[PDB]
Amino acid sequence: MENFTTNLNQLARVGGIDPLIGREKELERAIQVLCRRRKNNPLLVGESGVGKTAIAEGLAWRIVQGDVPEVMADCTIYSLDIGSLLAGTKYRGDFEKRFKALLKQLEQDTNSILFIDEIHTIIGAGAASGGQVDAANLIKPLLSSGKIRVIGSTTYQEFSNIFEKDRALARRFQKIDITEPSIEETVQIINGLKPKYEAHHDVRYTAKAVRAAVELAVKYINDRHLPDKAIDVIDEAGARARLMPVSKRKKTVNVADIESVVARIARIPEKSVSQSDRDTLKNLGDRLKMLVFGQDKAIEALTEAIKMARAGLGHEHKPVGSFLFAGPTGVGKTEVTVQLSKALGIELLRFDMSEYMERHTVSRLIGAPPGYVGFDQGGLLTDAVIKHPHAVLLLDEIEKAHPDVFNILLQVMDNGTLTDNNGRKADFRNVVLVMTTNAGVRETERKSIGLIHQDNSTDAMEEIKKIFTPEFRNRLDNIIWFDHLSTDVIHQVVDKFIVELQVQLDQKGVSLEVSQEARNWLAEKGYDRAMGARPMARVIQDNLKKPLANELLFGSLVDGGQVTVALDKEKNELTYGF
Amino acid sequence: AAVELAVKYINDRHLPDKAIDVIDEAGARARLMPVSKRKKTVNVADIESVVARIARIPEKSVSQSDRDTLKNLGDRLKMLVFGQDKAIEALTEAIKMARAGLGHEHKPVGSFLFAGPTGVGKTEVTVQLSKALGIELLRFDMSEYMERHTVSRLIGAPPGYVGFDQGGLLTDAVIKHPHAVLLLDEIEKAHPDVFNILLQVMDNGTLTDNNGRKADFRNVVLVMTTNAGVRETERKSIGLIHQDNSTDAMEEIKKIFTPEFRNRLDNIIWFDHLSTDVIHQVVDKFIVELQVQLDQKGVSLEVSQEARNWLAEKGYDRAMGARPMARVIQDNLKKPLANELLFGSLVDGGQVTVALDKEKNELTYGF
Amino acid sequence: REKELERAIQVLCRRRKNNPLLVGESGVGKTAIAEGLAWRIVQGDVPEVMADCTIYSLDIGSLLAGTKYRGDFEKRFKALLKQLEQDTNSILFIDEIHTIIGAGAASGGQVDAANLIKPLLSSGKIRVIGSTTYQEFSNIFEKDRALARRFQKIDITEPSIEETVQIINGLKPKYEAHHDVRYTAKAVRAAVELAVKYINDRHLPDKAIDVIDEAGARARLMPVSKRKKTVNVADIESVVARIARIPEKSVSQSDRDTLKNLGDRLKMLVFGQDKAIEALTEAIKMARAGLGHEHKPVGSFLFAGPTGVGKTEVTVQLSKALGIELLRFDMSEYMERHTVSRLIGAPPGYVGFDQGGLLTDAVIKHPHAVLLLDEIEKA
Ligand SMILES: Nc1ncnc2c1ncn2[C@@H]1O[C@H](COP(=O)(O)OP(=O)(O)OP(=O)(O)O)[C@@H](O)[C@H]1O
Ligand SMILES: Nc1ncnc2c1ncn2[C@@H]1O[C@H](COP(=O)(O)OP(=O)(O)OP(=O)(O)O)[C@@H](O)[C@H]1O
Ligand SMILES: Nc1ncnc2c1ncn2[C@@H]1O[C@H](COP(=O)(O)OP(=O)(O)OP(=O)(O)O)[C@@H](O)[C@H]1O
Ligand SMILES: Nc1ncnc2c1ncn2[C@@H]1O[C@H](COP(=O)(O)OP(=O)(O)OP(=O)(O)O)[C@@H](O)[C@H]1O
Ligand SMILES: Nc1ncnc2c1ncn2[C@@H]1O[C@H](COP(=O)(O)OP(=O)(O)O)[C@@H](O)[C@H]1O
Known about the structure:
It is classed as chaperone. The entry lists the keywords AAA+, Chaperone, Protease, Hsp100, ATPase. ClpAP Engaged2 State bound to RepA-GFP. This is part of a larger assembly, with 3 copies of chain A. In chain A, the strands form 5 sheets. In chain A, strands 1-3-4-5-2-6 form a 6-stranded mixed beta sheet. A 5-stranded parallel beta sheet of chain A has the order 10-11-14-9-15, sandwiched between helices. In chain A, strands 7-8 form a two-stranded parallel ribbon. Chain A has 26 helices and 17 strands. In chain A, strand 12 (417-419) and strand 13 form a beta hairpin. Chain A is α/β, with parallel strands linked by helices. In chain A, helix 1 (8-14) packs across helix 3 and helix 10 (183-201) packs across helix 11 (207-220). Chains in contact: A-B, A-C. At the A-C interface, helix 4, helix 8, helix 10, helix 12 and helix 18 of A face helix 1, helix 4, helix 5, helix 6 and helix 7 of C. The complex binds adenosine-5'-triphosphate (4 copies) and adenosine-5'-diphosphate.
């Protein structure tokens, strides 16, 4: 007792314990257990960081304050330091000697309570070249006789996995569940605790700041539990605003600072648009339309979803956007998404649904069940989302995956959460789910038989409905049906590819100019409505790169200069030179 | 009473210690009661309260505030889920029979299978029921359980395997919250082999995880939501007259769920589609939620009545239930609102009025 | 890393659980970030709150060395804890935070360095900086809820191109002193860009610097005839090629000749069907001339025609003439849908998982090769 436990009453007398607020029924039942005749040993079990240790030390704090029923008055709770207890037990019997001496001291006191934090650790305290003769059994007979009182604290998992193993020790304690408090209890706890943090960080918290901290930590941080994550938000806000007086920012911590802390912790695009975040969102449709020609309404839908997200009008809990892009090949379905990722400056999560042809490939997405060979790997999808919570999720050619795999995205779109094999949950509320497919293509490109050609516009939707279950479609933000590229779009695509080729050549230090009629001839040569834009890339490659490759590989353009490409009219041929 | 209740509701210790602990805690409680000198005998009510607090289960509460909570539960839910009253009625009656003590022997509070077209309040009624009771909500998306060997994920890996020390998720959750609402979403999309776990649970209210530990489901409401049988109900027959395909819905459900599984259910509540007035109420609900979102930004909003009617007429889709209304309201309101909140008039200001003209059926905006 | 360093400093000055956790992919610079915080403290490039603070890198080996005689490890650990508590101005840096969840005494196996430290961290008594990769974190560290709760998660993200360029600029003098070689700015930028484009198995601030160091080391092995030189873009290209398997600038050698006479060297082996040799040579030339695709295979060709016309022979001869391996797959063996699992592997939890995929592994082992799909109509 001299130097192995710390007097918690002494701490509360010197203010070393943060004050216990609320927890009325919990502490009342802890006292009730303490007042039993036999096995008066309460065990505080609960989630990690919900106030179990807080309750245990707040009992002694209340004793010092005297706001306790007049049966635990003058009782002194001591926190056991197992670490220092085991320090010098090098020789046989030292541990048992010191432990039993402390035990008889506690027996003689008849007023003290021994609080053992993380009591699940005492299932072994030294069997070094020996048997079960450690503290796990030394403490057993004293509890059953009701001579001493011990308070335990452990999480549900550690309890179930370690403490429940020894039924003899397990039955000597009274399990008490410390549940996570609700909103009002948490904000009141913060109200009672924040004087100390204001003192430590030399700041002031507004009431709205505290309420916002509570609500945001609730709806944005799903890693931890309320009474600790809220005060963590508070502490980090205090520290940040305390580091600001380098420019003499002696002021209160308003709501905006709380949102800064929450966004920097949860890695979310918060803190209201502002600065230029507004400029970037404003001309995003432009920066995309200059790289994706035609199919502008897809860019419109994407930008509207992103803005609604940043404007605070997003969904309560859903991905930023859940889009199904369907249309013929080579019309920019994946390109608009990749360019959106590059424009926003965030991560692109590309997944090739063609690799998920079989039903049993779901385990590749979410991980293998426990006990199996691939358990230690987790799942690819959820791991990627957890690593990059703010990103764009691209699922290429979802019609190629097994029709059953869609049921994962079902829950992902509905709730924005996905649980891997470890019970961990990925947060999809900050991702844009975009799925590309060629579903309605073959049905729209059909030939009517009869004297009257029919309207086949609805056939793309018919095919998509036949492929995707009604509940899967019912969770999509919108289905943007892409149309084929028109000839002016083809000219613009040819120009974009010319710019790409020019960049490639500038890398080699040579310049290229292509006459306008040459561009027109290339467009008229390569245009194929049924195949979109890839034939343009092919024809441009064949017509320009191959002659250019020969010219620069074999001397004529080695460290060359200007490439002179123009079109003649008699043969529709191109010119070349240095 | 101490003996009987410690037997029936404590299953972690052995009888000669269970009863002694019940009696000792009752004595300590009656000894702490006389802070106002109420040194009394231990009545049956005190023993019942002690065991209920030990078993973490609800006691007799026909007088407390939760009696009123149960009194107005059906209405406090009907204000959030419009139509489909029979589901709310069944849920509330099951919760009452459990709380009234006139419950099932050792079964869960209620075992209900919710089936019907998508986009209706099958899962939403469950979320709002968990909120209205203030009890934990355990959500399990059975779509993550397509393979038959994912049962190991539910109940844990057998001893002598890599995933043993983690334990099952379902049993661990129920251990953490013995009084909760258990939501199993899209169970027909899980592997049909998984249904046998639910067989065992529904019949006995107990479940043994990998550690031989038994989870107690007697105080957990079991609600499972499916979209099974919907294809037939909405499938058009060929002929001059269409048939009620509800018989086909029943046939499909029986195809998917073995006879004993259907026998271990409290009821199968067939959710209906949403009517037009129900659509109007849904529009009102979503507009209220949008108004809350805007007030978070400091923007008041007023939407006219005929604008509401026009939104409902534009978004009404019988096949998809209430979900299309979300998109309709989204595009028709949030888009101009997002523009005005980002690079427009509604930056730190509100008073946005939306009204419908009759020449173009368009919306008004602005300060 | 001023943003991340500022986040770390903000975390350290907190009242409770003021223990930042540097989480990031390997090679990103987590250990580098901690030791550079120490370095800037030495140079005073810190806010006054962290000034005059001493960071200690905790060694686990020497801490557990010889800790027989139950209590030796505990006594030693508590002695370290007491020295740090008395210092009141020290931060303990644990390079591998996921490795302190076990400290022997498997009998019972509970009183380890993890449970020994939780009271200190929860009380805000001591400041410790951790570091771990993402998978180690999520599979080893975060499993201990109470320990993960006492640490503040900081994501150390992969830097950008220009950030990498500046990092290499700042690190260059040490590599110069080590190799006695000098780097040109164009060479550094080329190293960064080529490492991004062609090296796929590492992350920027550890693979661009890898190219820099290896170029310096090889140019240090050039003065066997005393070829004293600075590192130009050419050496960088050679280095990045030794991993990408195709040099871009070495084409100024006889590689130009091999390209030029390739069509003929094939025509002497494949008679007729000149169109195929022409197409293949044009594709390979466009690739080697830098005009090829930046994210596509060198060439994707479907050869169709009657039997015995040289469809398979021309590809084998092309592989021979180029000196590259022939990744040969017969699509008649993949006549069934489920056979794709041979090419890509089985999902986790299934019998063939640890084997991997045939095609992907063959491609990874041979980054530069010709892929032949015999009888594709049979798959
Ligand atoms: N009633 C309370 N009053 C004030 N703070 C509380 C209360 N309950 C919890 N806390 C906060 O939680 C922290 C203490 O956590 P607690 O001891 O409850 O969990 P724990 O013992 O750390 O759990 P584990 O052993 O799983 O880590 C304190 O920093 C405090 O801010
Ligand atoms: N609107 C467009 N503007 C510019 N380039 C385009 C456009 N549409 C297609 N492309 C070209 O096509 C390539 C990408 O095509 P994309 O991935 O969009 O096709 P897709 O719609 O996915 O068809 P599939 O799924 O069948 O491949 C780009 O390299 C780009 O040059
Ligand atoms: N009765 C209702 N009242 C109000 N809103 C409803 C109702 N039914 C559904 N909704 C809307 O639908 C959303 C919840 O959908 P839910 O999860 O119930 O779909 P579901 O029944 O699972 O369909 P599926 O299983 O086919 O996906 C809520 O956001 C809510 O706005
Ligand atoms: N901020 C930085 N400035 C310059 N170089 C850095 C920086 N961060 C990392 N590096 C480079 O990375 C190397 C050190 O690796 P670092 O400590 O960053 O990660 P690590 O210790 O390898 O991580 P782990 O411990 O997980 O393996 C150094 O050689 C250095 O060149
Ligand atoms: N055009 C050709 N020139 C020279 N040899 C040829 C030609 N076509 C076929 N052969 C010979 O016939 C054999 C079969 O050629 P291959 O291309 O593999 O046939 P397939 O097209 O059926 O795969 C080869 O070994 C090759 O030597």
